[PDB]
């Protein structure tokens, strides 16, 4: 049975781009998936992404630019404050400031870099590099 | 040679505290009596009302610090100052 749309989606993206396809369709579409898809596209990892009204749960269509190396959803929603953030960068990224992470703060789903100056903690949701 | 920095008057005790430095480059450490007779000259104090406790010469240092006290009457030391620095200065046998 399905348990988490997001991690399935990120694994879908990564596995589809290892072979290196062009258009990827994610079946279990939800709002949080779209809020996620905003972030890295704002960093230019993916091309266009859009929503298709299927009639059951909606589909998400994405074009892949061949930019991401690994994109995965950290499951156990670790809540992290601001000043200790570096302790997690060493756990999911290959180098100093390489790649990003996604946090669901009080103000919504959004990139980790933009949260440092916004000064907001929250729970880690996913990562990509 | 002895040169002063601190000359401070304690009027609750009516006593003068003198912190001074002795220049002794290359010669043995001066004794108590010598500096005792030295300070009293240009400070113009009564020798019996004047007492010295310590003169510390540091390692590898030619300038040594020293502290002396200068009272006014013969009973102030007998009352307030402890009994050692009269004997070490010879003021009490």
């Amino acid at each position: 049975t399905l348990l988490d749309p997001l991690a399935n989606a990120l694994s879908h993206i990564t596995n589809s781009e290892r072979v290196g396809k062009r258009e990827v369709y994610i079946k279990p579409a939800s709002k949080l998936i779209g809020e996620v898809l905003r972030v890295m596209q704002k960093y230019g990892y993916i091309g266009e992404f859009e929503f298709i009204d299927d009639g059951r749960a909606g589909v998400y269509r994405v074009q892949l630019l061949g930019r991401i190396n690994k994109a995965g959803a950290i499951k156990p929603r670790f809540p992290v404050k601001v000043s200790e953030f570096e302790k997690w960068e060493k756990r999911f990224l290959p180098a100093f400031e390489f790649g990003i992470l996604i946090v669901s703060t009080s103000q919504g789903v959004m990139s980790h870099k933009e949260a440092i100056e916004k000064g907001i903690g929250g729970r880690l949701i996913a990562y990509v590099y | 040679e002895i040169r002063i920095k601190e000359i401070k008057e304690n009027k609750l005790i009516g006593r003068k505290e003198i912190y001074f430095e002795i220049y002794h480059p290359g010669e043995p450490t001066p004794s108590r009596k010598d500096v005792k007779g030295k300070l009293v000259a240009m400070l113009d104090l009564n020798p019996e009302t004047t007492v010295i406790q310590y003169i510390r010469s540091y390692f590898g240092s030619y300038i040594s610090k020293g502290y002396a006290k200068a009272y006014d009457s013969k009973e102030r030391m007998l009352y307030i100052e402890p009994e050692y620095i009269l004997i070490r200065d010879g003021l009490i046998e």
């Binding site: - | 304690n10 009027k11 609750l12 005790i13 009352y79 307030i80 402890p82």
Partner: protein
């Protein structure tokens, strides 16, 4: 285990409000009970021996105190463990030297020298209101002293109100109330040694004290416990406050 009260205090465990070399010696003088609390005051011997440096040894400080030269708020105190707390005025008339004990920004006590005109006024915060038989009202101050008034004038006093207290002959002088805009000096908390003016009074239920919002001279807004706020003037401080 322990069986009764103790008369000793290690130098290490001394209160953090004291400027004392902790590792100089093993032992320190135990403060006897007195006007203020342990966190608020210091033994007089440490004032004489360390802050003033008149006496190098404790024995001569004790001798001088026995001579009674030092006046504590206009009263000679020969004891060498007396606790001197906040806004107590220490006067030595032989030098004419008068100081007021005030908290540091770090939270330690320091001596602010003052002129002679300030040496006969002590501000006391009204810690509690009670009243005794004969319908005689009594006010317990923050420094552990007590004063008696009659029932008629009771509405002119409230807890936490400041009173300028002529300590030389025990005469009330003025009553500064606890109202918005009053000039206030902090005694404890992270905002210690601050002076500002009251803005808001945050009443708190469930045993939690009131919080007062104080704005500094430059307009910085902070908060502090009501007990920690000491009123010192209606609009401007009536005393020289660092």
């Amino acid at each position: 285990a322990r069986k009764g009260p103790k008369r000793h205090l290690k130098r290490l465990a001394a209160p953090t409000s004291w400027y004392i070399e902790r590792k100089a010696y093993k032992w320190a003088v135990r403060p006897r009970p007195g006007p203020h609390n342990m966190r608020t005051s210091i033994p007089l011997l440490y004032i004489v021996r360390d802050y003033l440096g008149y006496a190098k040894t404790a024995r001569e400080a004790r001798k001088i105190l026995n001579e009674g030269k030092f006046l504590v708020d206009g009263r000679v105190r020969k004891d060498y463990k007396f606790p001197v707390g906040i806004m107590d005025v220490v006067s030595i008339p032989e030098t004419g030297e008068h100081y007021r004990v005030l908290p540091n920004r770090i939270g330690k006590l320091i001596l602010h020298p003052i002129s002679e005109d300030e040496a006969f006024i002590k501000p006391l915060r009204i810690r509690n209101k009670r009243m005794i038989k004969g319908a005689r009202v009594q006010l317990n101050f923050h420094d552990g002293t007590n004063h008696i008034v009659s029932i008629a004038e009771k509405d002119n006093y409230f807890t936490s109100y400041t009173v300028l207290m002529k300590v030389p002959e025990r005469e009330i002088l003025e009553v500064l109330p606890f109202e918005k805009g009053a000039y206030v000096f902090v005694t404890q908390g992270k905002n210690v040694a601050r002076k500002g003016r009251i803005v808001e009074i945050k009443r708190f239920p469930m045993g939690w004290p009131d919080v007062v919002t104080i704005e500094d001279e430059e307009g910085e807004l902070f908060d502090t416990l009501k007990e920690y706020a000491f009123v010192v003037g209606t609009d401007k401080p009536k005393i020289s406050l660092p």
